[model samples]
Target: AHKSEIAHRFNDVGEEHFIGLVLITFSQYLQKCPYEEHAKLVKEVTDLAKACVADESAANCDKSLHDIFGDKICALPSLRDTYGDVADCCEKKEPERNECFLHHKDDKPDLPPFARPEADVLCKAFHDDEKAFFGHYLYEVARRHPYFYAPELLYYAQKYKAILTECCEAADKGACLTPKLDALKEKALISAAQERLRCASIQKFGDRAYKAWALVRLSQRFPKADFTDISKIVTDLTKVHKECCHGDLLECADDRADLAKYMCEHQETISSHLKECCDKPILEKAHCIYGLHNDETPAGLPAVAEEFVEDKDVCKNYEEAKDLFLGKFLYEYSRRHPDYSVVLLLRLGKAYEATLKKCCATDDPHACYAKVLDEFQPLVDEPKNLVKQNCELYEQLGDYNFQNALLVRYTKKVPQVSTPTLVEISRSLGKVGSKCCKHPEAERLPCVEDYLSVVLNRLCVLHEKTPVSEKVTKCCSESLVDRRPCFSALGPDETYVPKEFNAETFTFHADICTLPETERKIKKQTALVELVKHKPHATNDQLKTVVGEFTALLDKCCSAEDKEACFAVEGPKLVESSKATLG
Candidate 1:
């Protein structure tokens, strides 16, 4: 079966060519049957799509995109922009936009004054996101990543955005374009998005983007393509994403080397050269990098080479933030009064989720830790115009392909531990200082060092996030109080790298020497006691021998300041209550 399929070939294949094939194959299959027994099923599928247009959840994004371009959305003219920005492509409604402009605290504030029409803030808040800081601004670049919908959405969103710009210009040009050109473009964006939607539906079936082309072909050849076959394909595709990622999917295209090269190029990473077996990706690494396949460091080497074949300056780091921000903003703009692209909206949703996950694990956890600091500190003097961070509601996706694509070294940087205590300590330290922290003198020791550590790591261009430096180094031989303070800082990238085992729960004693002498013993003792604690309901005999030792170590080592430093009392025969009652 595989041999026969390989026989089929197209010089340059892409979604356009594949869709053309699906339709042609369908027609050929129909010819084989005199009465076409499966005709009903095919029609049923089309009807289902039509019904989808009516579903309230659909929000008719495809149709909405039509209206925004000043084309007809529904059969009825009155339904146009009924909800205005509130419902139809309302990226951030009046109240919400205003609210989003406020700095983030624990909870979001109530609706803005513009929500009532009588409020004075409406004029100021319109299209206000342009004012957002450079660091905070990001766009979803669906066009970059093949797995998500970059080629597909870009195909439509570009034209859709152009139309919007056109409409804004047309107001000055006197009137709208001739109805025929306007209608075709409006319908074109929806058609493009719907086609993208179809592709997205199939993407979940295969792991790699290229595998999609083959499966899509198989579906065309067989009237009833078995779901089992598709399932196996997905499994294999996942393996490629996990193991072969150097930006390119390892799946071989059906002799469409040029086409494969074109698609793979945008989907891979580039180095000076690539390894032999994994040599400079069979395609262009920049092309792959363009898709922002972050987790997959595009094949820079060939079977023997050391770097990528095609080296173009690529945004190895921070790509995800840039792509998601772009995709989201474009989608938001297209969804306005003239027309809203539903395809852009869905892609934005998915990418937003991935970006947030990357930020928590790789980009910067400190960015997510403000809430904790606010709680511990009585006052948080923040920027009066501190913008809200909607980045929180974003869900973590299994695929980090486009996640932080722009920030190549983002995940490689040391992660800022986001625990509440850590945040409060960092905040009080003022991005690192020898000055006083919120915690008392004793408690402030570790906290102050950690805060200074993070700031220094971020600002120091000389040192990589976790590099153990030997040169006149801040992390290698600096002194804090009496101890030599060489530090290893973890970036979000390194901390979140998927490992076979839980790094927190280890098998062997890790570099024990790395631990401070005083702290090393405490960790070992604590571990032994924790083993018993996990049992929870241990007998007195088991508890006494093990837990007692750790307690003693704590008593011996903890400074008077360590709150949990007290030792466990021995000789329990002097019972305050009756011995019989104690059992």
Candidate 2:
């Protein structure tokens, strides 16, 4: 079956969907028939499906479906017991019988909950006949969770085979198998949960929102990807979700696996992170790539926008070659503004199209478009300023402090957002800051803007379904270009007040001064968080002064002959000065 040229012609998704349909149709027969007949049934069905694909004959296919099992399937008690509703369909004629079986396969009896069998029982089944054992296993899984993608099923199957391979020869089979089995079950459950979440997000947000989410996610995940490549990846991912979310598990798995292959094949152009993922085992590569962070955007690219205004033939092309013109616009626009949100990019495209349509219809098209192009510049100013401000802050505060400052600012602006979520957002933004701010001065703004847009895109998604605060709602409602600025302009909640200062909040130890750079920064971040928690009312200027004083004290104390005594004495004075200023 694996070597069949006919099977290989169909993409993985197509092949799996065909096989799954066949497996689902014969699930009851597989369940109740003799173990010896299992392999025969699979082979016959595989051949039947392959024939139908090769020949495109409904009559022949239907005849094969109805006649393959003959009296054997009818005699099985499961025909009456489990598939009683579809039993009559088997007695019908060619096309009708085939259509009936196809229609009723979805209503197959749900497989029982998965439970690992005793080591002896599993080993006996494996040794008796490997084909029958795996056949039954795949059939049960296919029919039970008909929405599970094929690669995921294959992953489970491979894990099971590995477990048996090792345990069947072990001194104590159960001892060897239990932990591995438990681990497999744990991994499967987590995978299942993530699948559910993906489906849920698609279902809840709809395809457009899901596409936007995927575009931002993939762009960030593969930062080195060109906008064109990332856009294609997003389109492929969106197609997978459209099918998979609707319960086409086999096709979903097949296409998803294919997507991983696609990424690995194009690894040179996409990202190093993606390249690293491609090197993982086939089943693991997709998940590995899914978790990667954005690589640094390539440096030294020209930051100037492409000139659409100077093309006198652009209006002529816009009318005759609409899609290509718009595609070229997108390609050029995205390359220049790699930091712009997908939503903003889309809005810009739409606006540009509208402008072209209006100007193209006018008496003097070039003159009209020349004047109109200046109007679009203001739309990007907010996001551009946001990028500038973030890079400046990152340079001023450094990574840990930059992250800490973001946490306090966002927490104050969106008080209703969970602290853990706020922390994650801040940390991610900090990483972007660290990555982008270190680039050459000329390249830094666009780099920071691009990656910062990614973090803000995630924030927008989180608040889309449930508005955590009015500021969040208002900000999220703005164009993607304006959202971060909208949020940045928000003040602290009116009802919020800082906790009273405590001596414990500033109890800096002498050890902090001697810690490694990374460790010392962490200690400073901890102190900053504690200070914000205790002195939430303090202004940014007041906090900055205290931080500077604390840093100066640390520098002086670390150089002292008696470091411990210096910190014990100087830390208390610094804490007292901060308390007076903060109050």
Candidate 3:
């Protein structure tokens, strides 16, 4: 037993599997001197057999030599060392299984014995059609001993892939997503939109995104491989998500339109078809993350699993984008199983909510709204967190408080926190929910009518002793006239009332009384006089009632496209609900 008796076994990507991995993973050393004498005896035995067979034998060997050769002598380990290039030959290049080793070296521990460039080249080649990189080596190594060792190698390779498979299952990787996306976008399109989002820095979602697209192309290339399952998965998801978008797909002529058409056309069968379209772009965006995130990291370029998978995620740059598609398949299955939908939707909602915040921070708010609105279902009553946050932000930029307040009120009313504190919140309608404004500029925005009402009411009460003309006022008295004017209690301490686009004032609700001509003559108020010019706040409960009224009246109206004619003929007399004109 010379000093060179032990050889380190390695099983890299090309080696197939990791029986060695298990061996290494489980192997341990003695606590003290327990094995010294035992090891020495084994070495002594090894020295006796080092003289037996100095020739090749493992893969393609002669069986007759077994009886002729001294069995004891043959039992000794090979004195040669090959650990230096172990990772290179077995993992990267497919060196001849029998010739890859001859260990003996002063190689640095930090540097693997194999060629770094070759490793890089081989890694890149998995994505390259021209490289034939890992394929050549993998096939050669497997062919070297198709039975004696190939079977064992294959066993371990598949096993290794299986053990690690949990990290990236075909479904986990979002393997079959298309059909579901298509379906959701078509069916619940009113609720499937993706709203405002923002993402500053992301590591590499490109990988998963690319991988998803690759499968899409694959399914296209080989329809027989059950990619229809992927398509079904995508359609179902789209049916759900399409609601977030404002039918942008109908106007779209490209992929979005194609995806939408597919989902819309096969709404009934899509959920069950997810398994059929197994090759769709199922990788989810929420799964995308930075490398530093602990949830998971990318597995370096996988051994080219396919002969040619030259898609984006499969490309060199996609390692960063893998997470974006990780959650895609769940929705595909959830679409198929309504029973499990609650569980999957909870996770999908949370993850997508976080992702939308990152991806749409600065994108088009309308598009974001359209996107989320078209796809994701409303997790809350008012709107999804993302839409609510963004809508409030965009609404703040509006010139009309009445319009803004109507928006704020009619939406589902879930605020971020319960015990919200605002002085304006306690007075008047008493509803100053999370100050919907997120923009820094919005923080400084001019107050809305509801807000001003509280302030005005407070000022009026505080001025109990003051003369009506001298009352403190934050708004113009000459502009608006609301149901309750500030300072009425304080003898006109403040005269301004919150103006609003009160539908209560609409012709539909106007008094049908035969008023005297003198009173009617005084009703010629200008649009300027009609504006609210007051503080902002929501009254979501009452707003739904208003929306209901409008919905009932407008049911008979044509869609927006045909509205120009009705308006032209009816002139200013034509009146429908706000939902009709705005939506």
Candidate 4:
């Protein structure tokens, strides 16, 4: 009945295109049909197709076609109406008939979007008749999202089956299935969006730009792969994007699946992480590969490679293929110095581009370009040194205190920024610190630096066109990598005047200790913000001292036997300490 419904929904297009559509469907089925059945199925389909082309009114043609599939024909009801659609095509012979049918193959009806079945409906359908439900579900999904890759579609089916098996056995099947189905829906949407975006980027930027971007991204992701192998992978992936971006989705999916197979088969040349990804089932291997992270950079590499800067043709090569040239530079420089943040790598690339533009037009281009290594050495070293210093501070101060310290420092530097905004930024950066600080000591610096750079990016965007302060405006105007360092070097906002400390604005009480953990933290952070709001004139050390004192007082009071008594006795002392230090 559901198959008839599917056929009915598509029946508006009538039988004119049915023969062509059936031939296309037959072709698709042959690609995956078992080897033992291949020869027999081919013979049967060929005979029926030839008969149907010769005499559209032949009684046996439709019956034979259905007889060829036997029980399987029940799953493909659209084939039930194939005989009437190609009557006009019987007037033609052999090659012409074939050509006519192929031409009409793509004439599909415009159907409405597939309404996703509710969890109860889906589970009930599955329980009553599993195979029939799956057949309809696959047909509906494929028709609605015709461009979905074959393996990707199969992956979705497998996931749904798994979810049903787990949930249908549970006490509350709908309750168990709803959220997982929603999550799967989200994943499917993301995959669709990514496909669209991939095509858009390739179309807009051209394949060379895409290739360069892929090279840098893949190299960073599979750091353990030899550079040559990584470059080859990038080339193949770029080719796949170029061919498949606006073409047949099934073919595109097949190509991608084939590429994954090739990579997995040649896993000897890729990273260990990639090899592990290859171990997953064929349906899951590609997604696993996509989700894998960069392998840790092997130890004992140099801080920076001079070969790129030292090459005299650097400017000439850059001029020839600017994107690829810079991409190569970043790839080489980044893999060698895994300690540098991505922002720092981008900064180096930008700086190199600027330097080359200046030097390329000179009489002595080699001499001009030769100075790149020396000229940019400080730019490269500064971030490493700063990351070290910042991580050291993070280690000395715990998470809460470290975050408060950041709030204090940035508030002073960009005093023009509102207290709440600064506090939020501090909280975000502090979370980065908390996460990255847990990484291995060797990777911690870059980890922390990379995440901090990310937070700074949001800050820059927030203040880019707004009238913040001279320092902030200047810093925000710089490129991404330069922005963080610029903000780092900025002095206290010179034009801003400090307001007098107001003790009444912040009231510390025993009620904070009784609140939920998150609320308690927010309350403490709020008090720190109030303190920073009025003490913009205070030096970094003075601000740190006040935060330290306040934190210690709160810790002691919150954990005390008599919380209220502790606050009452110690809260005023904190206010006095703040008054003295802030003044």
Q: TM per model?
A: 0.17, 0.47, 0.18, 0.53
* lDDT per residue as tens, model 2, 304-413: 23357777787888899986576556555554454565445655666788888999999988887875557777766656666677778888988777887887776676
User: What clash pairs does model 4 have?
Assistant: 15-85
lDDT, model 4, position 379:
84
lDDT of 3 by residue, 471-499 (tens): 23322132122212322222311334444
Give one digit per residue, the lDDT tens place, for model 4 in 1-583: 2222213212322232222223223433322222223334434444554555555555444442223333232223333424335444435654454444334332122444356566777888899986556545555554433323334555677788899999987878878998898789756744543443344346544675456556655666766676677777778777666644433323344456677888898876677677777889766887778656777776665444345666666777888988667777777776665566666666777788888898888888777777776777798778667766777787889888788778777777887775655776778777666667667767775676656654664465345445566777677554434667787887666777775566655556776676656566666676666666676656768766776787687678777377878767877777887788866
Off by over 4 Å in 1: 1-230, 236-583
Candidate topping TM-score: 4
lDDT of 3 at 261: 47
lDDT of each: 0.28, 0.62, 0.27, 0.60
- Which residue runs of candidate 3 sit more than 4 Å off their true CA positions? 1-228, 232-328, 336-583
Candidate 2 clashes between residue pairs 3 or more apart in a chain or in different chains? 339-450
True-vs-predicted CA distance for residue 442, candidate 4, Å: 4.0
- Candidate 2 residues lying further than 4 Å off, grouped into runs, are 1-234, 241-250, 259-325, 335-351, 357-365, 371-389, 441-447, 461-466, 480-482, 489-537, 540-581
Worst 10 residues of 4 by lDDT: 1-10
**Which candidate, 1 or 3, has the higher TM-score?**
3
* Candidate 1 C-alpha lDDT tens digits along 188-229: 433323333233323323333333332332222221223344
The TM-score ranking, best first, is 4, 2, 3, 1
Q: What is the lDDT, from 0 to 100, of the residue 12 in candidate 2?
A: 48
